Symmetry: D2
Subunit: 200 residues, 4 copies
């Protein structure tokens, strides 16, 4: 089976819900899935200042912490990050800035990569942030597999061809977004399988 | 003198023309001298024919002058507006941009303030990345970029696009929140360009 | 065998030099290749002003115009346009804009896509232009195979992981640029093989 | 009073630091009040220890103070400089940017002028995209962006990067054309900011 790593950062929990959805879709497609969280860097008396975040950290207590070896293990990669001024979060970048030795070893090459984001406003960096996450993947020599428009479910969720994206109001995920997420991952598993298949 | 504002738009089916007009009127209200300017339809007639709203929009813009380099040489504030074509500006919009080669070489585009707008079928299908290419382009000129950011409450009301006014096209009269975020973007730009010119001489 | 469509624009011939380089690289890899010029739109009075322009149009007089059915045909794709203020040329965009029908029949997904470009300055849009061509292919749900740093030639030619990029200076194509175009094509054909062949 | 210029930079091994210093001198010459500000280091000792160039440069910047939101509240003009890390800015630069939510929330960054610079081991290795992301970030604040464009010969001679000064970090001393450009971009920015502030005294 295909080995799928889902590396997500999430402060207040939207990204966690998204990552959870992706993992279910991966499993559903016969994939071997790791759900991995990105290490929190923020001081405790920052986290302590808002409830959602404190709560979400506790909810993800039993989720393992991502590390470069999970990407070496993985054949398909999915990065998910809330936006922070149109780019990805610093927590996520800190994790990326530690893939140097794994990069020079050449072991990042040829993994499948896609991406996901969330933001407050429909147009508050929901495209650009993925764009940064896709630039980052190119330097590895990944094969990038965004969903694009390849279904009516994309249209019905707000139409984001670059990757799944969620308007984060605190409210639970819309089923049009889950459907958009389930598609992107399932699409990516199926390609990754073909790649490996024809590679003997 | 007042601020010399040029609004250069493309529009096949009219959402672009809708926004442009509002942006033009926002500059007029804010005291600018304003020119509304359509980008030339390059498409061939038989292709245009198979789309009625396209045909109708071209008639509807019969009396709007075509954008020219002379018009950007003239202006101190520039606003570009184009529908997304696969996450980037339209081929027409870009054809005009390619005629600005000489103006560039004169240094006659530097310091002119620039901002932009777009529209698309879907809410996320290039409504940010299309603007990003047009701003990426203004930087080659030395333009002084004035995107709206979150500097008003009415940007949050429209979908919160800090890069510039973006609108979801659905053959429906522009929504009121979209117009507000346009108006603020333009008025901001004009208020900033005024300040620029003053402290100059 | 793999069907490779190299679709390029050029005014003064840098584009065309590179595109030929790519096309012969693909032939050598065992792909069935189509080298395809993008249609010239510029008014004939503009063209008659530059000598290197009039002559390049003459050189390519025997090269076929690209058409949406070429991208329906091809399983792997390479787009190559010179920069125009950090973005692709209006001609390149003109051709892209004729793909809407072929887009809504979904008939553009699952094709591999990489890009190339040429600029006058080394930092004058050799990256931002490739980023925009890649952005377009995401809307089609193409599978992006940028070369990354997967070869010592890439470092030896400026180190553009997004795609081969040349600093136009009127000269003939440098050797290292020849070789990173080769590697970029060589790679994508190899990948497309493993994707078609393992997908029956 | 003169222009308040904040030059906030990150650097592991001196390239970013040497660039940021040159920008500082340029800003003083131009007649601005200048603060050179290092982006707080956040990497764990152990991996720092791996590299002694990293360590030596951290020591070398003992008396350069650490950047703070205060320093940007203060600034009428801002310059950001981060080396490239797989195409985007370093996690450190981002971590700093991430602390600005308070300033942003009370629009306390709006209408400040803004430019970026960077460095990278490879010449086509994200010396344009890494600046592009720092500019995206600045647009969310509603900051007037003043990139250098091709507004002077020195930019052509030093690479032709109209987005911001970029440097190929190879160990060697900062080349004479790189510095000509760093100076220019800043020099230009100080002048433009003055025109803004005079324009609503
Ligand atoms: C410092 C910071 C900057 C932010 N900038 C933006 C902004 O760029 N645009 C936007 O729509 N949301 C912005 N947000 C909101 C987050 O992107 C949003 O809350 C996120 O999607 C929540 O997802 P999470 O629950 O997984 O953390 C910002 C949040 C923080 C605190
Ligand atoms: C070939 C072409 C490409 C298009 N690409 C997109 C797209 O990528 N995303 C999207 O949401 N809509 C897309 N559309 C829809 C147009 O962006 C939309 O209809 C346009 O904004 C309408 O503007 P107008 O009324 O001013 O002509 C595309 C349409 C055509 C012509
Ligand atoms: C109007 C136009 C805009 C241009 N903009 C840039 C630019 O932004 N940066 C740059 O380095 N070169 C620029 N150039 C130069 C072209 O990128 C360069 O001449 C081209 O790569 C030549 O290759 P070709 O013969 O295949 O067309 C521009 C040229 C024209 C005609
Ligand atoms: C993990 C990491 C990623 C890097 N990625 C790139 C890159 O993709 N392209 C490049 O040209 N250099 C890359 N480099 C090199 C740095 O960009 C370069 O050495 C930078 O100038 C650091 O110099 P400074 O700390 O003295 O400012 C990378 C270095 C590290 C730490």
């Amino acid at each position: 089976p295909v080995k799928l790593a889902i590396v997500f950062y999430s402060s207040t929990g939207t990204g966690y819900a998204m990552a959870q959805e992706a993992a279910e879709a991966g499993r559903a497609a016969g994939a071997e899935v790791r759900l991995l969280k990105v290490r929190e860097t923020a001081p405790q008396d920052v986290i302590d200042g808002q409830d959602a975040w404190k709560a979400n950290i506790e909810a993800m207590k039993d989720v393992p912490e991502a590390t470069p070896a999970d990407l070496e293990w993985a054949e398909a990669i999915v990065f998910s990050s809330p936006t922070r001024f149109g780019g990805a979060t610093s927590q996520m970048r800190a994790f990326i800035d530690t893939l140097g030795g794994l990069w020079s070893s050449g072991k990042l090459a040829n993994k499948t990569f896609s991406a996901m984001t969330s933001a407050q406003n429909v147009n508050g960096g929901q495209e650009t942030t993925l764009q940064t996450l896709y630039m980052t993947a190119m330097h590895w020599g990944a094969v990038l597999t965004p969903p694009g428009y390849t279904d009516e479910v994309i249209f019905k969720s707000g139409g984001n061809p670059y990757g799944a994206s969620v308007t984060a109001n605190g409210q639970p995920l819309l089923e049009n977004d889950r459907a958009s997420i389930r598609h992107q991952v399932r699409r990516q598993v199926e390609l990754t399988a073909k790649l490996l298949e024809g590679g003997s």
